[PDB]
Amino acid sequence: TIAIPTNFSISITTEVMPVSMAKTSVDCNMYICGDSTECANLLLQYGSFC
């Protein structure tokens, strides 16, 4: 024995996929030391990981 269909249907389905994320930048002298000049000099006499 074998079973075969006799009718058909048309279904529409949706698929959602991410493509990109938000682009950002950081001012490290702003985040660290604010507007203070002494802390900026200390940052200088520390290292350039920025």
Binding site: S25, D27, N29, M30
Partner: protein, 50 residues
């Protein structure tokens, strides 16, 4: 040397142009003489607070 392109620079900076000092209105000198030049001083066990 710098290659062709667009680069992210530090955020816009402004330098101060004024000075402001605000203190309370006091016209009397602290009583150094009464504290330091007191005639009698108490014993350590019965110390006094002012």
């Amino acid at each position: 040397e710098i290659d062709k392109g667009i680069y992210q620079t530090s955020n816009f900076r402004v330098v101060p142009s004024g000075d402001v000092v605000r203190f309370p209105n006091i016209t009397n000198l602290c009583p150094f003489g009464e504290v330091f030049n007191a005639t009698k001083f108490p014993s350590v066990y019965a110390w006094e607070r002012k």
